[PDB]
């Protein structure tokens, strides 16, 4: 596994993949349901805002940041990623706006969705004809 592009994975598969690939994984802190999951496994890490290299190369972020700025902070690093879309539900965004806003990323990343049929939909927007 080396390519990018959208998939339909869960938190488990993202975490697993991120471990194996050593690739970066961003996490919206706001989603305390994800925080608990990660904090259970990775407990010796105190959650901090920003890069937390501990086991998996995490990037915890605040949903109040503009999708734009938060993307730019990944772009600076230029590191390859795996996550679900950065301005989606985690910004109150629709999947279309999410893709549009997330095209402003300049680092090569895996995206996710909640189901396999949504993959082709979201990728559709990442072409934008």
Curated annotation (Swiss-Prot):
Membrane topology annotation: Multi-pass membrane protein
UniProt superkingdom: Viruses
Domain (Macro): residue spans on this chain: 5-129
Reactions the enzyme catalyzes: Thiol-dependent hydrolysis of ester, thioester, amide, peptide and isopeptide bonds formed by the C-terminal Gly of ubiquitin (a 76-residue protein attached to proteins as an intracellular targeting signal)
Compartments, record wording: Host membrane; Host cytoplasm
Cofactor(s) this protein requires: Zn(2+)
Effect of substituting residue 45 to V: In strain: Isolate Shanghai QXC1
Impact noted for substituting residue 21 to A: In strain: Isolate Shanghai QXC1
Function: Responsible for the cleavages located at the N-terminus of the replicase polyprotein. In addition, PL-PRO possesses a deubiquitinating/deISGylating activity and processes both 'Lys-48'- and 'Lys-63'-linked polyubiquitin chains from cellular substrates. Plays a role in host membrane rearrangement that leads to creation of cytoplasmic double-membrane vesicles (DMV) necessary for viral replication. Nsp3, nsp4 and nsp6 together are sufficient to form DMV.
Domain notes: The hydrophobic region HD1 probably mediates the membrane association of the replication complex.
Protein's name according to its UniProt entry: Papain-like protease nsp3
Organism this protein belongs to: Severe acute respiratory syndrome coronavirus (SARS-CoV)
Organism lineage: Viruses, Riboviria, Orthornavirae, Pisuviricota, Pisoniviricetes
């Amino acid at each position: 596994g080396s390519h990018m592009g959208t998939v339909s994975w869960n938190l488990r598969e993202m975490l697993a993949h991120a471990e194996e690939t050593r690739k970066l994984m961003p996490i919206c802190m706001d989603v305390r349901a994800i925080m608990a999951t990660i904090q259970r496994k990775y407990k010796g890490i105190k959650i901090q805002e920003g890069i937390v290299d501990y086991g998996v190369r995490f990037f915890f972020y605040t949903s109040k940041e503009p999708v734009a700025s938060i993307i730019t902070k990944l772009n600076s690093l230029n590191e390859p990623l795996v996550t679900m879309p950065i301005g989606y539900v985690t910004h109150g965004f629709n999947l279309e706006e999410a893709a549009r806003c997330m095209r402003s990323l300049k680092a090569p990343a895996v995206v996710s969705v909640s189901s396999p049929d949504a993959v082709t939909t979201y990728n559709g927007y990442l072409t934008s004809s």
